[PDB]
């Protein structure tokens, strides 16, 4: 089976070009080529995190396998979910993906300006 | 067996009992507490779904957070200064009758899905 080219736009805004085998997941591509993306693929592709979140080009997105309920559950928890988002670890390379660009979106940690004040209730100590 | 109170996302209190040494994920799971989606990664420090909020005094004396826990706790939605990952917090006799809260998920917070863009341009400057 042949190899194809995939471009990644990093959170940094830097473009990484790499080559992946047809049939490999985009997570596999990130890992097997040791790309500079921090935090990506925490659950190691077992549909238990949202860290493999990627954004796809219009015409690639349109052609992706229908999203399973399982994926959708975890995709709902992706930070900054878009109408071109999928979990990269469920998306397998096809020949028609050659020279596509996917973007790695920012995490909740990148956007967070402050840590909230934690609280178990609004209840006044006097009452409690 | 010690008693823990969970304040659910609905605002409702669930009271349940856990063995010493069990994690709070353990407790949630073993007693089938209706908490949607809590502990996806089954306690392998690979999600943020076991996020819980603790009382001041309990929080302070919890086991020192590890880097592994902290990397994932950074990815929790609505991180608080009283937040930890429940799958890493084990019951002690001293925790009997404490209260924790389950914070809302990003999906609960969400009012709409955004427009996806691989990238932007301001061709006003071509
Ligand atoms: S790696 Fe965890 S869901 Fe894709
Ligand atoms: S259960 Fe996934 S990290 Fe706690
Ligand atoms: K905040
Ligand atoms: K939105």
Swiss-Prot record, chain B:
N6-acetyllysine: residues carrying this PTM: 1
Modified residues (N6-succinyllysine): 1, 93
Location in or out of the cell: Mitochondrion matrix
Cofactor(s) needed: [2Fe-2S] cluster
Gene Ontology biological process terms from the UniProt entry: cellular response to cAMP; cellular response to forskolin; cholesterol metabolic process; electron transport chain; hormone biosynthetic process; P450-containing electron transport chain; steroid biosynthetic process
UniProt keyword terms in alphabetical order: 2Fe-2S, Acetylation, Cholesterol metabolism, Electron transport, Iron, Iron-sulfur, Lipid metabolism, Metal-binding, Mitochondrion, Phosphoprotein, Steroid metabolism, Steroidogenesis, Sterol metabolism, Transit peptide, Transport
Residues reported in the UniProt entry to bind [2Fe-2S] cluster: 41, 47, 50, 87
An example molecular function term from Gene Ontology annotations: 2 iron, 2 sulfur cluster binding
Protein name (database record): Adrenodoxin, mitochondrial
Organism lineage string: Eukaryota, Metazoa, Chordata, Craniata, Vertebrata
Gene that encodes the chain: FDX1
């Amino acid at each position: 089976e042949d190899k194809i080219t995939v471009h990644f736009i990093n959170r940094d805004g830097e473009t990484l070009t790499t080559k992946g085998k047809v049939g490999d997941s985009l997570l596999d591509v990130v890992v097997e080529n040791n790309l500079d993306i921090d935090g990506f693929g925490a659950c190691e592709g077992t549909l238990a995190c949202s860290t493999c979140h990627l954004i796809f080009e219009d015409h690639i997105y349109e052609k992706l396998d229908a999203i399973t309920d399982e994926e959708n559950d975890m995709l709902d928890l992706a930070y900054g979910l878009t109408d071109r988002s999928r979990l990269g670890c469920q998306i397998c390379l096809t020949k028609s993906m050659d020279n596509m660009t996917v973007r790695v979106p920012e995490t909740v940690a990148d956007a967070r300006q402050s840590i909230d004040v934690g609280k178990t209730s609004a209840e006044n100590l006097y009452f409690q």
